[PDB]
Design a protein around this ligand. Structure first.
Ligand SMILES: Cc1cc2nc3c(=O)[nH]c(=O)nc-3n(C[C@H](O)[C@H](O)[C@H](O)COP(=O)(O)OP(=O)(O)OC[C@H]3O[C@@H](n4cnc5c(N)ncnc54)[C@H](O)[C@@H]3O)c2cc1C
Ligand SMILES: Cc1cc2nc3c(=O)[nH]c(=O)nc-3n(C[C@H](O)[C@H](O)[C@H](O)COP(=O)(O)OP(=O)(O)OC[C@H]3O[C@@H](n4cnc5c(N)ncnc54)[C@H](O)[C@@H]3O)c2cc1C
Lengths: 426, 426
């Protein structure tokens, strides 16, 4: 009754836990057949952002819930199946499942004039139910819609093979003996190339804009464990950048030596890509770096340097769009596409609505959603209060100006936070 | 007529090339159906030291013959199939195949009282032929016989699964869905574990004595490219050790943090194991480090720490014995098992017999066998000469004392040379 939680992935489970601890009644609605969010999809063969070789790139003890450690037998970087199993175990332990409605997709969420929210949901039959709830917490993730390149290169319509997005990608043994191009250089791109590199006959890695590729580990420590270290926090933002630049050079040399393009920005400016594999796969000839794709010639892909390769498939690892189809007016934004949420959570003008998990930090999101969940629970039952709308808008404007100043315009920049100072105010 | 070369792998092809350039007639006898030595066996499904995932761990431009570069499209670390194809291409280019007798196994080599050598060979039929040759060059490799642990752990005879050597290992998809233990920490052990780590359900890495595990690359340079660098040769043996120890720490931390045993010797003392993969496979939980195997309990392996695991297979990656079954008195040795060859090539008491490739340097053997081949060719047609037997024995005693002093006793220590000073005298 009191709260409808949309989604039972890592974020929504944290919200359900925080609400349950305060005696706040709630129901959690999940589209999938089980809890876990993206982490259970591979393994269920379901189409989603993950893939069968996906592991954490964050340390296990900083990715698990703080009051619910993962099994001691788990490694530092558990597999997706281990994470999914861990998340379902939490739900069981926390007593959340009697509040979870599976195979229930939220279709529409509207604010009623007297305050509560009307939520329409569709069950497994396809039936539709209309319920009213006092408040709504959105935990539906932001890796929802595939983002393919604005213009697909010329000739894509007359391509003898299959063009797909990483969402459609699952294993790679599905490309055994084939020839495949991977487009991009994010986390998905390097992992998928690496996987393809052991199944396909030829794996090409088409890159246009360079990113800094970083090993998962320096000095034996994970990069996220490094940021928590006190000596690292004692260093100045340039002593850090300096420290990393030197460590990278020693650990792997220069990016250009791998046939990759050098980024136009320093290591911490922009997104780093973590991989223990991709540079080595290039040295062994199992992945061939290329520049952008210029066109499609039947069974062949032509690149902007005049070279061409036969290709049975192209896998676009170009990311996801943040979308909220059940919100008619969408997530609050500032036209520029900049998200407008107070402390990254609260809409300034929609009382009783909250967004949890819509933050992109360095490292695991778990401590962030835990603090958001706890704060939202106290907002729900009146133990915490909000500023007036103007003052909330003041914090939003200040946060955005600091973002433009830092990452200027790009995409998704307006949910970026640094885990340290953000957690500090909770 | 003049020279019989035993073996048409990398070493024997180099010998044939050096002899052909001097007009020295020769025939090269090879057991296998083609040239290439170990490098063609995977790919032909043949049992041998290699495996289907085996790549060079040496740089391509320092592993190829100096007058015959590998294709420019080859990567830094070519696959075994690329190396095998490259070696056959050399043989064709160098005009060696009309001198090569394939599917011909040498059965016996005996010195006749008047000087020449009687060689008995067996062809494809199984027929035996006896031929006399003026001189014999042995290029039969030293990775011939499997070396399994002196005592297999108790209970091996009542083991529900299969115990095999790395010689018998080929791919790993042959262990799909299974549970496997790998014994050892050499090059074969880490590569095979890494491969198993993507096929098997569980891969355990049983290690007793610790070795230093080193990435194939530091500062973007291969470790063998580093040793040739002039700044590295300008450094003192401790400035080097010091330099590496620090670089390792930055590149991967400490071995003990991976659940591996720390070696009892500094990095350059003993054999280093090169791998870009094994430490990361451990962090992802895809390889589980263990100590020695204490026993076999049906379908389970018990380790010296009291733990146990179900296991369908155990792959012993414990190396190879150096053997010469066609030499009745064997390779000349000093009883201690120490090889007794002048400049690592020449027996002191057997005129007209030579051993090429029986050296273990840091990095690729190719420049060494090239210099040995050229020198042997000049020995064969009288353009170079040898010391008296006592003086040759003097060089052998000096070399051995320096070996014991350096690597003390161990196994195979008596063919170890440092590529730099060894090439320097040719
Ligand atoms: C490829 C990839 C790799 C990542 N790797 C790491 C990593 O190594 N370490 C790390 O710390 N973080 C990682 N992350 C980020 C983070 O762990 C995930 O984004 C995390 O799963 C976020 O959880 P969530 O609950 O916010 O979102 P999700 O996992 O997306 O869960 C959202 C849930 O909402 C449900 N839902 C959506 N719409 C509806 C609807 N209309 N009705 C009902 N239910 C709905 C979905 O079915 C889903 O179950 C990764 C993210 C991606 C995409
Ligand atoms: C697993 C492994 C990995 C290696 N990786 C590298 C690497 O990455 N880089 C590098 O530089 N070096 C590497 N080496 C070392 C080196 O490249 C090989 O040892 C090299 O193949 C040596 O060539 P060879 O001709 O001396 O020996 P082999 O390759 O063993 O060739 C010997 C030949 O003699 C033949 N022969 C033997 N007995 C007879 C007989 N009675 N009659 C007829 N023919 C006979 C055999 O059939 C074989 O073809 C590796 C070695 C091993 C075992």
């Amino acid at each position: 009754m009191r709260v409808c939680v949309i989604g039972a992935g890592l974020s929504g489970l944290a919200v359900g836990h925080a609400l349950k601890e305060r005696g706040i009644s709630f129901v959690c609605l999940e589209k999938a057949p089980d809890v876990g969010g993206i982490w259970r999809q591979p393994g269920a063969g379901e189409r989603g952002p993950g893939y069968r070789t996906l592991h954490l790139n964050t340390a296990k003890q900083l990715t698990g819930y703080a009051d619910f450690p993962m099994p001691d037998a788990y490694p530092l970087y558990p597999r997706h199946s281990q994470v999914a199993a861990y998340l379902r175990s939490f739900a069981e332990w926390a007593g959340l499942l009697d509040h979870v409605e599976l195979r229930t997709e939220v279709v529409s969420v509207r604010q009623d004039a007297d305050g509560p929210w009307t939520v329409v949901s569709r069950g497994a039959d396809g039936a539709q139910v209309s319920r009213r709830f006092e408040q709504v917490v959105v935990a539906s993730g932001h890796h929802n819609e595939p983002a393919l390149p604005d213009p697909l290169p010329a000739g894509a319509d007359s391509f003898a093979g299959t063009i797909l997005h990483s969402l459609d990608y699952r294993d790679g043994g599905d490309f055994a003996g084939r020839r495949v191009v991977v487009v991009g250089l994010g986390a998905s791109a390097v992992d998928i190339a690496a996987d393809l590199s052991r199944h396909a006959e030829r794996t090409l890695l088409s890159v246009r804009r360079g990113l800094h590729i970083v090993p998962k580990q320096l000095f034996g420590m994970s990069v996220d464990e490094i940021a928590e270290a006190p000596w690292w926090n004692e260093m100045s933002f340039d002593e850090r950048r300096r420290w990393v630049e030197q460590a990278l050079l020693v650990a792997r040399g220069r990016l250009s030596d791998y046939g990759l393009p050098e980024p136009d920005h320093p290591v911490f400016s922009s997104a780093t890509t973590l991989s223990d594999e991709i540079l080595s796969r290039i040295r062994h000839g199992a992945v061939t770096p290329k520049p952008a794709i210029a066109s499609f010639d039947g069974d062949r892909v032509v690149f902007t340097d005049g070279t061409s390769e036969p290709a049975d498939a192209v896998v676009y690892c170009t990311g996801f769009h943040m979308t909220f189809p059940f919100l008619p007016a969408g997530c609050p934004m500032s036209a520029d596409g900049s998200v407008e949420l107070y402390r990254r959570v609260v809409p300034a003008d929609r009382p009783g609505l909250y967004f949890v998990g819509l933050v992109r930090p360095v490292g695991a999101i778990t401590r962030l959603v835990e603090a958001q969940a706890e704060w939202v629970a106290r907002l729900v039952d009146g133990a915490a209060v909000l500023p007036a709308a103007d003052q909330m808008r003041e914090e939003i404007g200040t946060y955005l100006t600091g973002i433009v100043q830092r990452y200027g315009r790009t995409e998704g920049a307006s949910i970026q936070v640094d885990v340290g100072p953000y957690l500090a105010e909770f």
